[PDB]
A paper describes a structure:
The EPAS1 gene encodes for the hypoxia-inducible factor 2 alpha (HIF2α), an essential component of the cellular oxygen-sensing pathway in humans. Under oxygenated conditions, HIFα subunits are hydroxylated by prolyl-hydroxylase enzymes (PHDs) at two conserved proline residues within the oxygen-dependent degradation domain (ODD).
We crystalized the PHD2/HIF2α-CODD complex in the presence of FeSO4 and NOG to stabilize the interaction and prevent reaction turnover. The HIF2α-CODD peptide is observed to fit into a cleft in the PHD2 surface with P531 positioned nearby to the coordinated Fe2+ atom in the PHD2 active site and the PHD2 inhibitor NOG is observed to coordinate the Fe2+ atom. The loop containing V241-K244 of PHD2 wraps around the top of the peptide, enclosing HIF2α P531 in the PHD2 active site. The presence of an additional glycine residue (i.e., G537) in the middle of the CODD sequence of HIF2α relative to HIF1α results in a reorganization in the surrounding residues that maintains the side chain interactions previously observed in the PHD2/HIF1α-CODD structure with some altered distances between the corresponding residues to accommodate the additional glycine residue.
Numbering used by the authors:
A (entry chain A): 523 to 542
B (entry chain B): 188 to 406
Write the structure that this text describes.
Amino acid sequence: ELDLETLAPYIPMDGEDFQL
Amino acid sequence: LPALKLALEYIVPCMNKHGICVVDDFLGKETGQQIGDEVRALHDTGKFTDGQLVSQKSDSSKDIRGDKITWIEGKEPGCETIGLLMSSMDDLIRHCNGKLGSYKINGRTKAMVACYPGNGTGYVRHVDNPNGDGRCVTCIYYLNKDWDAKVSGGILRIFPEGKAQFADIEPKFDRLLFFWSDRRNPHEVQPAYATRYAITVWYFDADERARAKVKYLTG
Ligand SMILES: O=C(O)CNC(=O)C(=O)O
Ligand SMILES: [Fe+3]
């Protein structure tokens, strides 16, 4: 089966996450 | 409708039962138009670049998603109404706390402002969060005045796992959409033949997002 991460929309994976 | 009533009487049951929840006329036409101008301004001033993938392999990102995007924190000058949208989304999510599955939502992305520039651009079938990157809720605000999907396409079709029907979401003006980001909701953006704008924020589950950061920082 395909790696679905190769189709998934990019998000910054460190130090850009807004805390609610 | 207060956030409390929208959240508890609609978003929560809807998300827990269907995993896809639409709120029409979210901010009203006046705020909707202002957001649409801010987005046009970004577009016009060349802020958008090719939408990217979590894992880039041999094919171009453009083979997968035909949109161009920018990321907005909400405090940039000329983006304040997008910031109000983001706060309004945030407010809704905060009023859902502890009742959206067993998620504990502590944070989110910046806003992804995305434009499919017509021309048959779309997004192939995908899952927003297939491998546990922390995203638990996808939240999209549409701002396309005069959108006629039978002519301009651009339907978001979602295929909720185990359901007798798929969900066709027209990218209609002032429409807010929530759906679970994980593999329950594979979805696609069907080809668009006019300029289609949407603003996406993804909400993070605290525990899953912590594990994702751990895997990534030691990946
Ligand atoms: O814009 C839409 O309706 C849906 N967009 C996406 O699925 C995405 O960018 O991940
Ligand atoms: Fe998506």
